[PDB]
Symmetry: D2
Subunit: 496 residues, 4 copies
């Protein structure tokens, strides 16, 4: 009996999942790694700790689930997008921390180009915009701030790569330095319209072309694992794609109209737009969904920087709760937040505001406000934000979603699901297997090595765990939303 | 068997009773809290009956547990939370509704009504206040309008209005006296601080009969004696009433003009004795009576802050984030800065100098790296930023420049706050050895009345410095922080449903 | 708005309470207040008498002012209280010469030992129906007279007055007009002869306590006097009821006839059984004391005492700061199916019925690494029950009667888990009344019946209504298994005794 | 430059640790990773053999990366471990057939009672230098073979292998090349005759354990083989050191001959004394076991065993959720002048030296209404000290020697209160080392010397640096009173049994 090992290197933890022929989870292993906040707005990881974590979950899932390494037909790698890494080709070590997709430490770089009118250029080519959110400015940051980098890059001693690249490069023993369309399209360097590194964007980002990896399809055998990194086995690595794109795939969203929403560190709703890249006029991102079978699908994306990450904050920042699940208890202990709103713009505001300078704020507080209200308010933010992007997309698409499929870590919190159904007046469908990112990447690989004959097995296996129906008249609905919007304005007013 | 003067400070969240010996020292202290009711957002109400029983409790407590008999009490001094209104049936002797607290924003509409009819300017020239839900007047009309049967009764002479002083003195004297003093009267919005009498016009606008009103009196004067049964068989003279903040002013020796002090309690209040000439303000400060004594009446400029220490108390009761108020200093000093975070505790709107009833509490500058220590520190700092706002507004209206400010109140104990205050305002902060000046002020008003003390001077010659905090930060860092503060406030006023 | 009410004051070990009662026997208002519990040394337990007075004075002011009831509508006052707690004060100044020594205190131990070693324990039993334990007032008095500087000089000049809480309250509240007590309270002083119904001159000499400090014993339902005006809002309301808190509970439970039994779960756990009017002698560790004095008659009863019951749950809260509130313990207990070998013996101040071991202290057993916080709390909650059973079997012998359904009351009866477990571990039905504060209800009637606010005591029975009956629900094997472990815990607990 | 290192793995009862030692004997890196503890039924303690492996494999990876050191810079590997803890796996699939039974578990009580009732206890004492307590490996294997379905018949077909953690780790790490154990670890199995040095046939039949499952007993400092490339980043580094954690700590403290005594405060408390090559029989509840095999020599030792020491604080944390971290405990304890009569006897898994009572369980005494966290927690911390004194005196009488300055180490030795009270309660100075992770240091040297990284063991004696000494500051009066009470608390504890 064979299996497909999937690695989901997320923003706050790494995960290894085994899938049997039937598309069931044969095992799961998870390890968190440190998050660094050196200065307000900044967010960084330690590339070496990420590697060792991914290397850890693998070893774990194999041992704890009684399955040989020689039973892995293939490996799929899906990851936190944009997070940049720059290492020494030879010593194989990062020359500096990985600047996470959330970090605002490249703001000035953006402001420079933005002030030179180049934003429009980046929008027309990358389908993105000039926000510190994307890989491009992070490389430039490293080459301009990290001593020696500039000259090491000129001597062809350095390599760039988003997490997908970083992992595959290490796992294959430096055999392959590649990335797929989806990941590449989130770098501000890749021209998503002609599908190739844009020379102009590179010069404009003062980034050498020798550091870039080869851009390949999302379901292809990029190589094999080196024996010592996989228990003496050379297992093929045949799947790569950004976590959210892989989730899209995992939800069986293969053509126009298909929309899904993921609640992880951040909140991300993507819609498959087929092979016709669609331009957004409401603050959505135009990006590549995935490359498979000679085709290249595009998609519209709505990005929320902080979603579940706001609960983690309640836990690690304010030490107000011990675990994410505990939050629900408080939230369900009060009829409402009684006027209190929480805008988690910890790293600016994404779709549709796109405000890098905005920071987390809280409003409507009164002597009577207590934990229950405060925590509940935080939980509700994941919903108010989803609506923000949901309506923004409903207008750039014209399509009107009526039953959204969800997934991610936070989707198991029932209050969040019901309140989401209510606040949007739409049904929310939660799957039996909520780890769709993992599942998605597993298929990109399984299909590439013939573990599965067709992607449709995914649509067929999808099982609804529970649907959530709206239970809140307009009266209250729009009142609450009306207030959220005011809360978001006020947030934007606070800037120094 | 030496005697003592009993002071009662009926504050916003607790009642206190304090004994004082000839030497002006504390012979004993008793405190006791009472429920704060928040029926709706912005609303604040107390149970007038629970306030009475609490006052009655602390008294019993302070004498029984300090080996001091009731017969050794030369006089009683009563100072209190201002504006809090109580409307009760003269006959039954019990309130017809919770006392509406000074912080309450439930009389908002009423204040708007009058504004839209263009009366605000009238109230300013007469009361020296303005049309904010902060003052008594509107709270009375509110009751008369919203409490079933309230009017039928109010117009039969069956009801009596009263701010806490009037309520306490009336009950304690066994219904013998239904009086108030100038200081308390000036905060009702129905008293003309220039004519020193109730204003018949203001009363008609607030649709408040003149029969419910108590008679204004001096601050130091024997208003009557406590009925035996509410004071252990004795008939002790009640000879001292005055708003809690004014009392603090008097207990700080701020007698002459230009004298300024700041109290850090549930709220933050900065009064400046303007002598005997009510100075007009154009920076958001109030004009009100300091005290009535020696046949004279002093005026003063006030800077008011609805939520100060109350914010720290919220970290405890609300977010159940700290065990005790003083436990906050622990966290604050654990991290070097707030790192961008600010806290604007407009739980019940903003006072001096913004005066925004609609405003609410908000927090800014948050990031994933924001830890619990930063959040609490930003709260402790807000008491200071707020004090600065008030201080600059007064520096203008008075033209005077404070080089060293005297302080008092429950929160002064916290050294972090005291130092940060001195830094952010760039002025020396002086903390007295006996910080409960409010209770000590009421002591002397009573004492001086019953001739327990010769002169008020004693307060000055007996006052002693506990510690003086002096500024210790650069100019750049100063304005940078204050710049963000104002931004925070600015943003906070934008959020209005 | 012109009905009258009866004010009941229950001055308990950890809190004071004031409760109003209408003609219909319903609660017209309730006011509670706590007071500091002093523990100067291990086993010592003391209150500040002054603080008790001011607390009683507080709940009164509170109950009338916040229930819209004037003082002039109070037909009478009932005063029931924590027993044994001794107070010694100067008649003149009117204030105590030392903290009140609570009934739990073990600071008078040596004194009890001395008397035992002189072979007097049998004497006190035949006379008081008690025994030489630091639990009763007598020894506490001598303790003060012996250890408080100048105590003797003054005690022998008539300058001092002894009194258990009832005496202290009535004296202060009556403005020094009455220095009395009733039979129920008196029988717990160790100086009162429960057979001759009078102070025993011999017992007093042994305790070296002058007869001039003693108050005069009276019936339980009788107008002892009127409250002085200034301590009751200008009114002179009659004080017409006094009786030990537990007895009151017995009366309020309608346990008037012989064979009647009830159990109270408060600071301690007390099981009284009205033995009619014939003091039954015990040989299983139960006490013999006066139930009440009413209608010209005097009833007796057998008592099973437990020093620490709900006080153990209160210890989880104040001591180990392990739970937020008492009722928050049920949450944990029901979270785990069993204690998994763990047992808690709360002999904080020794063991009462049926062990009577002053030297014993609290102990916990059956611990393992797997022992979680839930199990620990559950083990504490369960001890209230085990202890109840120990007392129950001892009484089943001394009376030969078999309880098939026990009535209960007290602060802890609210906790369902404890109720069910009691019903199970004892294998008997437990009945929880709708009005669980029977102790104050009892004091109410003693007063009311005196001042003629009610015709007969029968009303207490006709008006009593069941809230819920708990019925046994576990096998025989499991029952005894648990109880066998309990006794083992107890057995070991008595083995730990330092010098 | 071209600098080498010695990787040391310390597989402890509650966590696995990897430590790098440079030529100078300094720590070049540390990595720790806790693993789950299972308490299926009261008294039972078990670990998941696989999770243990994946943890050790984890700490290795971490220490190497985080500390920027190449795998090819490792001169050698040393493995030290939690003793007695048993593991039984399939020779072929390399999978344990059931959880590892931890040294603490009491789940083999009935087995002990059987043999104990048949008079065989004296047999085991005379041969193993131990006794019939569920604390040792022997009964655990039998438990597995008798209770785990299929085990019996798999063992008869030679499909199963036995091994204490050291063996398990070396067998996995070396790719099944080596299935060995050293003297120290072996001498804690109830199967190894410590007097003639070999698996005792009688004891084996008597434990119904096949001889084909037993590994080879080798010296404590010898190259047992190499790591397979895939379990060590493509490198085949030599595995040249094995020894029970406590023995390794003895060696680490520079206790090489008679008189040398140390005490470790980890999950459990263990004091060992080197008795040279003459195995000394104990008459006061101590254990006679092998210290280590090195240079053709095989030193013996006297050991005092306390099942629960630091493990009692962890309990306050995980069990009662009374504190958030072990270190926090001190805060409370230092906040009161005494426990005011409260005692805590953490017999969570029976009592060891010198009481040896498998039935005993944790108990608490001296409680009153005035007892509060500070007193409760402080009492717990003090138990670590009282228990040490129990064995200290028990050893001072079997040895005749009188210790007057004990060297200490372990996870709980960084808690000053515990060190000062210990000095006080015993009336002896307590010396705390700079490097308190001596177990790792010791194992590292067994390896390092085996591969020639170091020429002699004396380097250990010379590098030892005293971090802080603690002197007694408590008159007999109070001293003897407190201990007197402790003893009573222990008696009372033994009374509670069902
Ligand atoms: N029960 C829960 N309730 C609320 N939030 C949760 C819950 N479980 C996990 N989360 C949140 O989900 C996030 C982790 O989800 P995941 O999709 O694994 O992250 P990522 O997208 O970074 O891979 C965390 O930020 C966590 O706070
Ligand atoms: N819900 C509850 N669960 C368990 N114990 C309780 C609960 N409520 C109150 N208790 C306990 O009951 C006791 C209260 O005693 P009470 O019956 O009021 O009279 P007294 O104070 O005279 O003993 C306290 O010790 C308290 O811990
Ligand atoms: Cl809501
Ligand atoms: Cl700051
Ligand atoms: Cl149980
Ligand atoms: Cl001690």
């Amino acid at each position: 009996e064979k299996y497909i090992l999937s690695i989901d290197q997320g923003t706050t933890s790494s995960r290894a999942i085994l899938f049997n022929q039937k598309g069931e989870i044969a095992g799961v292993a998870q390890r968190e790694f440190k998050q660094y906040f050196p200065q307000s707005g900044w967010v960084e990881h330690d590339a070496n700790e990420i590697w060792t974590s991914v290397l850890a979950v693998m070893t774990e899932v194999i041992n704890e689930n009684d399955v040989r390494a020689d039973q892995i037909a293939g490996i799929g790698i899906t990851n936190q997008r944009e997070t940049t890494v720059v290492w020494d080709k030879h010593t194989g070590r990062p020359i500096y921390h990985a600047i996470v997709w959330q970090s605002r430490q490249t703001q000035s770089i953006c402001s420079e180009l933005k002030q030179q009118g180049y934003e429009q250029t980046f929008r027309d080519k990358t389908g993105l915009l000039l926000d510190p959110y994307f890989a491009g400015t992070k490389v430039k940051w490293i080459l301009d701030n990290v001593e020696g980098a500039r000259e090491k890059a000129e001597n062809g001693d350095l390599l760039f790569g988003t997490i997908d690249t970083w992992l595959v490069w290490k796992l294959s023993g430096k055999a392959a330095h590649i990335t797929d369309y989806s990941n590449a399209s989130r770098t501000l360097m890749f021209n998503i319209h002609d599908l190739e590194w844009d020379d102009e964007l590179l010069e404009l980002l003062t980034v050498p072309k020798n550091m870039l990896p080869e851009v390949k399809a999302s379901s292809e055998v990029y190589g094999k694992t080196i024996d010592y990194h996989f228990y003496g086995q050379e297992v093929p690595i045949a799947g790569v794609a950004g976590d959210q794109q892989a989730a899209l795939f995992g939800q069986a969203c293969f053509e126009r109209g298909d929309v899904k929403n993921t609640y992880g560190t951040g909140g991300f709703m993507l819609m498959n737009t087929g092979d016709k890249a669609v331009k957004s006029e409401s603050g959505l991102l135009t990006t590549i969904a995935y490359g498979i079978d000679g085709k290249v699908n595009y998609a519209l994306e709505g990005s929320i920087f902080v979603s579940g990450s706001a609960i983690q904050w309640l836990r690690d920042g304010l030490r107000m709760i011990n675990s994410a699940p505990q939050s629900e208890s408080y939230a369900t202990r009060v009829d409402s937040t009684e006027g209190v709103y929480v805008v988690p713009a910890f790293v600016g505001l994404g779709t549709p505001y796109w405000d890098s300078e905005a920071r987390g704020a809280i409003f409507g507080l009164t002597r009577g406000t207590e934990k229950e209200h405060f925590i509940r308010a935080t939980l509700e933010s994941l919903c108010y934000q989803t609506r923000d992007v949901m309506e923004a997309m409903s207008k750039d698409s014209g399509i009107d979603v009526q039953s959204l499929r969800v997934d991610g870590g936070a989707v198991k919190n029932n209050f969040i699901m019901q309140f989401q159904a209510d606040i949007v007046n739409t049904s929310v469908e939660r799957p039996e297997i909520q780890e769709t990112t993992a599942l998605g990447a597993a298929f990109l690989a399984g299909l590439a090595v013939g573990f599965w004959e067709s992607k449709d097995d995914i649509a067929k296996n999808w099982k609804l765990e529970e649907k959530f129906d709206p239970k809140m008249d307009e009266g209250e609905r729009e009142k609450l939303y009306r207030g959220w919007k005011k809360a978001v304005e006020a947030t934007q007013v606070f800037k120094t």
